[PDB]
Design a protein around this ligand. Structure first.
Ligand code: MG
Ligand code: MG
Length: 226
């Protein structure tokens, strides 16, 4: 189908983020590839401005749900690919419990044969010795369910989920995600029935990289319709 046909093979991915958290300005660039056939993508991210002022794990959700594997019997519910190549706007508010919040605006679209995620991130009202600005988050990542519903009035989707970030003392830092996606182009898109994406993510380091960086391996599969 339109859009989906662009994802049958391996697709290069570029991610570019500019961020400001409590006045700490930074940029991140990522490169990698995705194979939606297998719900798989791999990326390496670099902080191009120096040291990242927030923990890497807090940026994972912000840093391409078009690479999710939609089972054949759910293909009519894949909004993300249906909006391609023109793309979609992905906006979030991320509430860190007992701490500050991120607001993000991204455009995800093809530039030539590459899938590009371009993001502006703004974080405010973080505690200086909270888990975020105090860098108390472990370098790992849990598996989540990402809940999706149609937003027919916006010709898009509404998405909600709760990220669990492990803290170095055994506790959990919750990050409540509220998300909206709307197409950039004016063509038709697939508006889905309620369903979810099951995610899993592995964080690692490149032993040959001296810059502040994150290597990510992610698998995502749509479910919840039988
Ligand atoms: Mg196929
Ligand atoms: Mg633990």
């Amino acid at each position: 189908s339109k859009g989906e046909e662009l994802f049958t093979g391996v697709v290069p991915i570029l991610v570019e983020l500019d961020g400001d958290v409590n006045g700490h300005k930074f940029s991140v660039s990522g490169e990698g590839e995705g194979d939606a056939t297998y719900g798989k993508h791999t990326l390496k991210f670099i902080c191009t401005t120096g040291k990242l002022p927030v923990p890497w794990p807090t940026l994972v959700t912000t840093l391409v749900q078009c690479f999710s594997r939609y089972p054949d019997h759910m293909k009519q519910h894949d909004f993300f690919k249906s909006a391609m190549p023109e793309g979609y706007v992905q906006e979030r508010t991320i509430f860190f419990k007992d701490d500050g919040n991120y607001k993000t605006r991204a455009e995800v679209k093809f530039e030539g044969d590459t899938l590009v995620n371009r993001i502006e991130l703004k974080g405010i009202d973080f505690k200086e010795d909270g888990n975020i600005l105090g860098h108390k988050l472990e370098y790992n990542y849990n598996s989540h369910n990402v809940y999706i519903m149609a937003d027919k009035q916006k010709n898009g989707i509404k998405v909600n989920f709760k990220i669990r970030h492990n803290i170095e003392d055994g506790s959990v830092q919750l990050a409540d995600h509220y998300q909206q996606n709307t197409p950039i182009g004016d063509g038709p898109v697939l508006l889905p029935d309620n369903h979810y994406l099951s995610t899993q993510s592995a964080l690692s380091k490149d032993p040959n990289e001296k810059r502040d960086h994150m290597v990510l391996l992610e698998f995502v599969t749509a479910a919840g319709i039988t």
